[PDB]
Amino acid sequence: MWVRGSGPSVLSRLQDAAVVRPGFLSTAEEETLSRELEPELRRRRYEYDHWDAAIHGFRETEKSRWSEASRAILRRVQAAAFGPQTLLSSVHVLDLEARGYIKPHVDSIKFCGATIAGLSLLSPSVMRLVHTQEPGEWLELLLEPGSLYILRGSARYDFSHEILRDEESFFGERRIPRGRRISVICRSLP
């Protein structure tokens, strides 16, 4: 329903490594972030395209000074995704344009620890993970507004991950029209 896989083996080994909690956020939680982030996002334009960047058609910011309503929500993520694993000083807020997308990559093992957790806002999209070593081993995730994903262990380190572009935005056989989508991403320290 939300996770698809190249085979039964990838699905089993990555069962608590790459996970999807759709409807992690209520409507009211969704609007709290949406509303809080819009001014600081509108305050910048969709930054320049440099062919070899991972992210295209995006603007972004790092936020650490949050409302009490928004802090409550990140703590929920923190609670649900991280253990004893310290957080980064701040949260990465990524605003993709409908025409924007994210190419396959692994997050900097230098700066990002062993867990990545993203909240998804506004519009649906699919994140694809492919084994770096083995192209045949992949998982696609359906990320809906209000969803939380967690990428940890081997899905963080031996798999690349990407958010598909509108012309490729498929979950199995089903087109998932791409719109503007904000991500709120929480990362662990090395």
Ligand X SMILES: O=C(O)CNC(=O)C(=O)O
Q: Residues annotated as binding site?
A: 105, 107, 149, 161, 181-183, 187
What is the binding site for ligand X (CB under 6 A)?
54-55, 94, 102, 118, 161, 163, 183, 185
Closest by Cα among 20, 14, 1, 2 to 134: 14
Binding of Mn ion by 107 (CB under 5 A): yes
Residue 81 parent element (H or E): helix 68-81
Q: How far apart are CA 41 and CA 59, in angstroms?
A: 7
Q: Which pair of tokens denotes residue 85? A: 């694993």
13 vs 103, which CB is nearer to ligand X? 103
Number of chain residues interacting with Mn ion (CB under 5 A): 1
- Taking CA atoms, 161 is separated from 18, 53, 152, 169, in Å, by 11, 14, 12, 14
10 vs 141, which CB is nearer to ligand X? 141
Taking the complex as a whole, the smallest distance from the CB of residue 156 to ligand X amounts, in Å, to 11
How many residues would you count in the chain? 190
107 vs 158, which CB is nearer to Mn ion? 107
Binding to Mn ion (CB under 5 A): which residues in 21-50? none
Q: Which pair of tokens denotes residue 176? A: 């998932």
Half-sphere exposure of 126 (CA within 13 A, CB side): 26
85 vs 123, which CB is nearer to ligand X? 123
Q: Tell me the binding residues for 2-oxoglutarate.
A: 149, 181-183, 187
Provide the pairing of β-strand 170-171 with 55-63: unpaired
77 binds, among ligand X, Mn ion, none (CB under 5 to 8 A by kind): none
Residues lying near Mn ion in the complex (CB under 5 A) are found at 107
